[PDB]
Amino acid sequence: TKLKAPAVLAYSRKINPTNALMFAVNWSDRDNTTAVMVGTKTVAGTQSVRGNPNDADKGNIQTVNFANLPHNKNTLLVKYNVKFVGDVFKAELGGGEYSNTLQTALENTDFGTLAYRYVYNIAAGRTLWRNRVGAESIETVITVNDQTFTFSDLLVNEFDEDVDVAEIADMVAGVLSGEGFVTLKVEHYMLLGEGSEVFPSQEFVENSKLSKQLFDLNGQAAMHDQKIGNAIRTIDTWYEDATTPIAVEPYGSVVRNGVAYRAGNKTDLFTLMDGAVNGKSLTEEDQMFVTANLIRGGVFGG
């Protein structure tokens, strides 16, 4: 045989998203931002737990974290920065043979299409998640260095070819191929209406002391950076189970549905990576999947 996974091996996050700060504006003037704050209102009435005969009567004070767009401004502003980091084949942890042979094996990877679908996940608006719903007008601007480019909608899953997304993807692929960094600034504008429901990222609620303790930075509503990166890493259509891009993953799995798209049918990262380095030559789409999950990072050794 040949080289197994090392005692320690991991790669670092190469798509670094800033945590989103959400503002409220208008489509008339898109710069008079306000603060979409997260307050608390008391919710009582949720009862009837399992094995409750007489104790299903108390009024639990559950000051849940409500999140609504203000009535004054009828356009949400999701503002965040996206930072592409190069040197996506150098492993910080473990970096050795397995990793170098990986870098020489993944030399013919089409960085252009990875960059294209990376910028597409911003231009389509998958990063809004439940905020893109309820909007007929979506505005996406990419404030990369001294050039702002506007994007309407490109459809979260429908993957056509666009010109300006590709011309951003040129220097994005130039950063991701070798070294260096590029930082592109993102603003997202939607009519949701007055008193509409804005949906930021949730958080850990275990006990029945609250219901939602959503991620807000300094009291202002926020998307988690991991969720924004999850929207970024929705790359895989080389998943041989279907055609609704999954968020790349060593097993292609979501916990939201509970199924695993790439766990077992020779599309694991571990088996195909061992095949990639150990000597088995492979195709372009799954090699690009290895490359994209190497922009994801994670642990790759045991």
Binding site: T46, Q47, S48, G59, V133, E136, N157, A231
Partner: protein, 165 residues
């Protein structure tokens, strides 16, 4: 009674029933359910489902509801109007939980707060284990879960596409 089909496209980003909730909310505030349009789902297994069917007696054309669901065209599919001899219409059932009835009893019967809690201390606690839908509300500013169950047909309809009495 002729009917038209609305299909929610599969989306890993948003919820399949969550799009259905925003479909039902936008079908409320933009008219549609005046007094005759009703909604049934062929896929009552555990959740509401993904395919929406509207069985209005005069007939729902494709042009009126493709502009009504103009905010949902990212993940929707609008079918052709077919015909059906019988649809499985549903009805709205509410859940009563303690303080829903406590503040009602002091208003009508004129009892005290401690008196009203004494009569309802060892009762209530209704929790439906049946398919529900989280459609919110615009007249009263809170969100809630609405429960729908299968029963007999009725002539008239409410503003939620469900049957009355």
């Amino acid at each position: 009674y002729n009917t038209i089909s609305i299909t929610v496209v599969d989306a890993d980003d948003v919820g399949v029933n969550f799009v259905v909730s925003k479909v039902l909310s936008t079908l409320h505030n933009k008219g549609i359910f005046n007094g005759e349009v009703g909604v049934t789902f062929p896929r009552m297994d555990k959740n509401v489902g993904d395919i929406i069917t509207l069985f209005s007696k005069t007939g729902v054309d494709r042009k009126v509801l493709t502009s009504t669901l103009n905010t949902l065209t990212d993940f929707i599919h609008i079918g052709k109007p077919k015909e059906a001899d019988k649809v499985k219409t549903y009805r709205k059932v509410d859940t009563k939980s303690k303080g829903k009835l406590i503040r009602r009893c002091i208003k009508r019967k004129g009892v005290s707060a401690e008196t009203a809690e004494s009569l309802y201390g060892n009762y209530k606690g209704e929790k439906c284990k049946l398919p529900y839908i989280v459609v919110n509300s615009k007249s009263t500013g809170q969100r809630f879960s609405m429960f729908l169950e299968e029963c007999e047909n009725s002539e008239k309809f409410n503003s939620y596409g469900l049957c009355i009495v």
